[PDB]
Design a protein around this ligand. Structure first.
Ligand SMILES: Cc1cc(CNC(=O)[C@H](Cc2ccc(OP(=O)(O)O)cc2)NC(=O)Cc2ccc(F)cc2)ccc1F
Lengths: 169, 86, 100
């Protein structure tokens, strides 16, 4: 169906990120993030029955973990930290990430927590399992320049590769 | 052990043969030299920089830093990375 | 420790140790370029280097010459030594206005 297809598409781009860590534990995450600068994040499978993926991110207090929720074909941050209306929904978990990452990059959010209750997620640079493809490292670089890839002096085959992963992280 | 790679404006690059085999299209073709007649020098130098960045950081033991790509050569080097399959 | 460089002449990619001597570099160019170290001269920036010093004693760090951004070095090969001439690479074209 529309759900089933969009679901598998979500994991397929998750495999393209290079910062997906699959079956990882919290203690393995806490270790791999103990030395990273504040804001470094990774995505891994969740050890809870009702959750698939989970964000592990470093803060000045140390590594912490946030779960990602799936309900009727929509990804969103765990609904137990805030009212659902303040937690934006998404199709791809990567689009979820790219949104919360780009917000901090735009200085619309900072490393300090707001006092008015809204969701606070400080994300800077990802933590890669392996060096990505040079091709993918431009797809990222190009996407940080423009979102109108079909108006570029490129062969059509190259643009279709860009259209598979449109995010900036 | 070493391989020499030639660009369009003739710039010669010598890298470790292991560094060059990350590119899939080069691996199939292996004199110990290869001329790339479409890829200019400013693009050819960065692909070799990616080769080292790939070999050193294949393991996640060291924190993988970001690969800096200036937007001007991004268009060109994407076409080159598709040529070399890396 | 590791310090990644680019020997460029009229370009060689390699890595080295921060404790390696500058003479140890002239031995690596002898392997591929097939020229003796006595017929070799190095020139970081515009300055020659003593073969007894190390790369760190000449101003090379793992933070300055990472593999993704390797600090480059120059070489000048009859009677007298040649002059150090390195040709820059091509100029990247103008940015398409959409990406500007
Ligand atoms: C960033 C952020 C955080 C929160 C609240 N977060 C928690 O209180 C989580 C709860 C959790 C624990 C495991 C987990 O992993 P998993 O169950 O496998 O998905 C997922 C979530 N506690 C911890 O982090 C404590 C911890 C730290 C290091 C470790 F090594 C082990 C445990 C709210 C808003 C916000 F912006």
């Amino acid at each position: 169906s529309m759900q089933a297809a969009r679901l598998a598409k979500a994991l397929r781009e998750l495999g393209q990120t290079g910062w997906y860590w699959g079956s990882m534990t919290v203690n393995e995450a806490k270790e791999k993030l103990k030395e990273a600068p504040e804001g470094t994040f990774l995505i891994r499978d969740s050890s809870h029955s009702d959750y698939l993926l989970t964000i592990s991110v470093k803060t000045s207090a140390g590594p912490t973990n946030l779960r990602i929720e799936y309900q009727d074909g929509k990804f969103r941050l765990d609904s137990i930290i805030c009212v659902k209306s303040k937690l934006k929904q998404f199709d791809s978990v990567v689009h979820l990430i790219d949104y919360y990452v780009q917000m901090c990059k735009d200085k619309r959010t900072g490393p300090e927590a707001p006092r008015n209750g809204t969701v606070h997620l400080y994300l800077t640079k990802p933590l890669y399992t392996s060096a990505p493809s040079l091709q993918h490292l431009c797809r990222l670089t190009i996407n940080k320049c423009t979102g109108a890839i079909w108006g570029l002096p490129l062969p059509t085959r190259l643009k279709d590769y860009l259209e598979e992963y449109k995010f900036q992280v | 052990m070493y391989v020499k790679l030639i660009s369009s404006d003739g710039h010669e690059f010598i890298v470790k043969r292991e560094h060059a085999l990350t590119s899939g299209t080069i691996k199939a073709m292996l004199t110990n030299e290869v001329n790339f007649r479409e890829i200019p020098s400013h693009v050819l130098s960065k692909v070799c920089m990616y080769f080292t960045y790939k070999v050193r950081y294949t393991n996640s033991s060291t924190e993988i830093p970001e690969f800096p790509i200036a937007p001007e050569i991004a268009l060109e080097l994407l076409m080159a990375a598709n040529f070399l399959d890396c | 420790m590791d310090v990644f460089l680019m020997i460029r002449r009229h370009t060689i990619f390699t890595d080295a140790k921060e404790s390696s001597t500058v003479f140890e570099l002239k031995r690596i160019v002898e392997g591929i370029l097939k020229r003796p170290p006595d017929e070799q001269r190095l020139y970081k920036d515009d300055q020659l280097l003593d073969d007894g010093k190390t790369l760190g004693e000449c101003g090379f760090t793992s933070q300055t010459a990472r593999p993704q951004a390797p600090a480059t070095v120059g070489l000048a090969f009859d009677d007298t030594f040649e002059a150090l001439c390195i040709e820059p690479f091509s100029s990247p074209p103008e940015l398409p206005d959409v990406m500007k």
